[PDB]
Amino acid sequence: SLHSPGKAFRAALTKENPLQIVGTINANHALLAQRAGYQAIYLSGGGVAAGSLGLPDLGISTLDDVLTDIRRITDVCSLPLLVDADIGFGSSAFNVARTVKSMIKAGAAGLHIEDQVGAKRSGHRPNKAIVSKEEMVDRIRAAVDAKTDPDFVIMARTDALAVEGLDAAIERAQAYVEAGAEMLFPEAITELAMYRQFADAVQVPILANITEFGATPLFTTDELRSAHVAMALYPLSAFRAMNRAAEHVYNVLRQEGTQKSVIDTMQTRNELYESINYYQYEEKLDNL
């Protein structure tokens, strides 16, 4: 009985409501998130693009850019990792299936696929386009059918709220769940009551994307729990703070000609070592 990341993801859900899931930009941060107490983590598509590739979250990244990051993270962190699979990385059901089987094999616990057209955009940006309900239904069926691990999770995300309104988004969501989606990700919700309506209408775990500087208020876990939200996602929160701190170090070092004045903003060498279990490894080298 080999370990199933997906099974571990489903177990975390039953032990935390809502289950907080934080984006981890790289393997180091996955370890930091685990040490902080989280029971599940996330690989943001916008993060693979903007962080790993330094590019816009506009469907430019490829499946392999993401797989590389999944392997790096799951090779060292035992937490179940939910992965952003954008639209499935291809225009046919064959692409969706390969995507699903590859991510399962890379170590992921689950993934979400959205109903946007090819060159997708952040769910919190204007002018997004979505495929037909039928089009998305086929994507979902292909994904579910491709599962090699029954516990791997196939989550459906809908970007329809801002484009077709709430009733339309709910109808799509119900059809997606009927097609096999196991959990639902209604993107960029503006009101708490909406989460409740979605939850009541599809009766499968609901995810709330609590990202900064977008269309969604910074709801607390208490508020989300009252709306029956199953999980709270913070996709790029740590990444945003990491970039500001790094930018600060770069600027000060450039203007001052030394980093002395910003040493107090740095994780210490010992802290890094403790994060990666450094001493236990070096000791083994010394014993040779």
Q: Which position among 132, 190, 226, 270 is part of the footprint of a second copy (CB under 8 A)?
A: 270
145 binds a second copy (CB under 8 A): no
84 binds Mg ion (CB under 5 A): yes
Q: Which position among 17, 95, 192, 201 is part of the footprint of a second copy (CB under 8 A)?
A: 95
Shortest CA distance to 111 belongs to which of 98, 127, 130?
98
Q: Distance of alpha carbon 166 from its chain centroid, rounded?
A: 23
Burial of 31 (0-12, 13-18, 19+ CB in 10 A): buried
Name which of residues 108 to 127 contact a second copy (CB under 8 A): 117-119, 121, 123-125, 127
Q: How far is the CB of 74 from a second copy (least distance, A)?
A: 8
Q: What would the DSSP string read from start to end of 55-81?
A: --SSS-S-HHHHHHHHHHHHHH--S-E
Cis amide linkage into residue 186, ω under 30° from 0: no
Q: How far is the CB of 2 from Mg ion (least distance, A)?
A: 28
Burial profile 194-215: b = 16 or more Cβ within 10 angstroms, e = fewer: bbebbbebbebbbbbbbbeebb
Residues that contact Mg ion, how many (by CB under 5 A): 3
Distance, CA of 143 to CA of 187 (rounded, Å): 20
**Interface region with a second copy, contact rule CB under 8 A, candidates 87-95, 162-170, 188-196, 200-208:** 87-95
Residue (76 or 168) nearer to a second copy, CB: 76
Decide which of a second copy, Mg ion, none touches 119; Cβ closer than 5 to 8 Å per partner kind.
a second copy
**Beta carbons within 10 angstroms of residue 10's beta carbon:** 19
Closest residue to Mg ion in the complex (CB): 45
71 binds a second copy (CB under 8 A): yes
**Interface region with Mg ion, contact rule CB under 5 A, candidates 48-56, 83-91, 186-194, 206-214:** 83-91
Name which of residues 200 to 259 contact a second copy (CB under 8 A): 210, 212-214, 218-222, 234, 237-251, 253-254, 256-259
45 binds Mg ion (CB under 5 A): yes
Distance, CA of 282 to CA of 271 (rounded, Å): 16
Decide which of a second copy, Mg ion, none touches 262; Cβ closer than 5 to 8 Å per partner kind.
a second copy
163 binds a second copy (CB under 8 A): no
- The torsion angles phi and psi of 83, rounded to 5 degrees, stand at -120, 140
Which residues are bridge partners to 153 per DSSP? 110
115 binds Mg ion (CB under 5 A): no
The secondary element (H helix, E strand) that includes residue 47 is helix 45-47
Decide which of Mg ion, a second copy, none touches 84; Cβ closer than 5 to 8 Å per partner kind.
Mg ion
Which parts of this chain interact with Mg ion (CB under 5 A)?
45-46, 84
